[PDB]
Every structure is written in C-alpha cells, then in structure tokens.
Design an enzyme around this catalytic site. Sequence first.
Site, PDB file in Angstrom:
ATOM      1  N   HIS A  29       7.924   0.189   3.735  1.00  0.00           N
ATOM      2  CA  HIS A  29       7.503  -1.090   4.272  1.00  0.00           C
ATOM      3  C   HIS A  29       8.734  -1.908   4.641  1.00  0.00           C
ATOM      4  O   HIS A  29       9.833  -1.694   4.121  1.00  0.00           O
ATOM      5  CB  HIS A  29       6.655  -1.879   3.270  1.00  0.00           C
ATOM      6  N   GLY A  30       8.542  -2.852   5.555  1.00  0.00           N
ATOM      7  CA  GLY A  30       9.656  -3.710   5.889  1.00  0.00           C
ATOM      8  C   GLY A  30       9.199  -4.978   6.568  1.00  0.00           C
ATOM      9  O   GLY A  30       8.009  -5.198   6.809  1.00  0.00           O
ATOM     10  N   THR A  38       0.826  -1.189   0.000  1.00  0.00           N
ATOM     11  CA  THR A  38       0.000   0.000   0.000  1.00  0.00           C
ATOM     12  C   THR A  38       0.869   1.252   0.000  1.00  0.00           C
ATOM     13  O   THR A  38       2.050   1.221   0.360  1.00  0.00           O
ATOM     14  CB  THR A  38      -0.920  -0.018   1.216  1.00  0.00           C
ATOM     15  N   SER A  39       0.276   2.356  -0.444  1.00  0.00           N
ATOM     16  CA  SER A  39       0.949   3.642  -0.364  1.00  0.00           C
ATOM     17  C   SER A  39       1.072   4.071   1.091  1.00  0.00           C
ATOM     18  O   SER A  39       0.145   3.899   1.887  1.00  0.00           O
ATOM     19  CB  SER A  39       0.181   4.691  -1.166  1.00  0.00           C
ATOM     20  N   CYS A  70       8.281  -1.780   9.220  1.00  0.00           N
ATOM     21  CA  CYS A  70       7.948  -3.027   9.892  1.00  0.00           C
ATOM     22  C   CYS A  70       9.181  -3.843  10.221  1.00  0.00           C
ATOM     23  O   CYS A  70      10.155  -3.852   9.468  1.00  0.00           O
ATOM     24  CB  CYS A  70       7.095  -3.906   8.992  1.00  0.00           C
TER      25      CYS A  70
END
EC number: 3.4.22.56
Lengths: 4, 146, 94
Positions: free
Chosen positions: B93-94, B34-35, B135
């Site tokens: 993100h991660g 997601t953005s 993340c």
Amino acid sequence: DEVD
Amino acid sequence: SGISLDNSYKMDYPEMGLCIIINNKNFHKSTGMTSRSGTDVDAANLRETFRNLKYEVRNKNDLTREEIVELMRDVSKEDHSKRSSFVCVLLSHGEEGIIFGTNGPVDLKKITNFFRGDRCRDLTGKPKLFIIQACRGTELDCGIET
Amino acid sequence: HKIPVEADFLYAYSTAPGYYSWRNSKDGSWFIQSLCAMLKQYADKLEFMHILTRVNRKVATEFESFSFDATFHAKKQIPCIVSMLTKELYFYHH
Ligand SMILES: [Cl-]
C-alpha cells in the site's frame, strides 16, 4: 481488480 | 586506443548487483489495511525476471516499517564495489511519497536517502533503481476512447 | 568535480502522481506484470528508458478495471518514469  | 564514448553506464562489473524485493501482503490488523492479493505473483515474476538479468535477488516478505528502514540501512552499508547497479522493488500500500510497512508508513525519501551519492560511496556514479508498485493517492483515471 | 547526491536514481512508479494503482488478485499488478514481460522480451535489445516506455504503453492500452462498484469500474492506468540518470542503461554488455 483491486487498488493499492 | 581509438575514439571512446561514455554515454552508457558501465554494466560489466563482476556483479550486476542486488535486487531487493520487499513484498508486503499482510498488514497488522490495527492498520486497517487490506491484504494485497496477487502480490506473491508479482514477487515471483520479479524474482525470476531479475534472476535472468543476473541480479542477486533477495525476496523479503511482510516487513514492518522498522524492518524496512534497517534493511535499507544494512544493504546500503554492504560492499557494492564489485556491483554495477542497485535495484529495489517495493510492493505495498502507499500514498504520494509513502509506502507502508506492515505496521505503518515509511517515507520514500528516507529509504532512498541511504543510497545518496554521498552516503553510499560504493554506488556513487552507478544506477540506483527503485520500482514502486503502490498507491500515490486516490484519484481514478476514467480514460478516453481510442 | 562533484555530482549531485540525487543524480543516478531512477524511480519507476506504477501510476501517475496522485492516482490509485491497480492490482489483480489473480494475475498480479498491471504494472509489475507488464514490467516483467517487457524486461523478458527486451532486456537484451533496448535501453532501459525505452523498455519502460513499452511498459507505459502496455499498461495504458491493455488494462482496464472491472468492478461491480461504478466508482471503480472501467478505470485506466498510466505508469510514471522518473529519471535522474545521467547515462543510458543497458542490462547487457558487449
Ligand atoms: Cl498473493
């Protein structure tokens, strides 16, 4: 609030 | 001269150093990610904050995993001899050990390895800071009262 | 003498190992908002680990998620300082  | 101590990093080189900010907001559709709404706020806060610390800030937006690796590599081979430190902010993100380019993940160890004491000699003995908003898994902290 | 090739790194993670990290679509991420505020207020006053400890307390105490989805509502976050530094780091000098 959103998660990454 | 008088007695000396050296418990603190030398931070009075001519330059504080680079602050690389990788701000990943929009991901390739095929990734399903997601953005990351609100990350531009972070990128701007960081830019201003590290500007006032006298870091040479570079903001980079929406980098693929390939662009992230090349940028880290290129940056590691610059002349850091006149710089006190190095800072890299990753916004994305991660998962545990991983951050995402727009098109897929990058091992954190691969990014940081460019700056190892033996592979970036201009930064040997100098503080290398990696600040990671991403993340590290999917657990949630329920907290406890008081 | 040599030093370890891994010495002199600091990893300021926004969240504990294995955990989600929270980002507000309007105000920015909990950790980054807190980090900038504490750098602004203390970069001319505290050593970096003590700044990042203030960030830990700020995130831990001032933020709690709000979600229509019970699974994601009322959750908390603690950032995670990982230090392989060999000296104190002050952003100012004498
Ligand atoms: Cl945004």
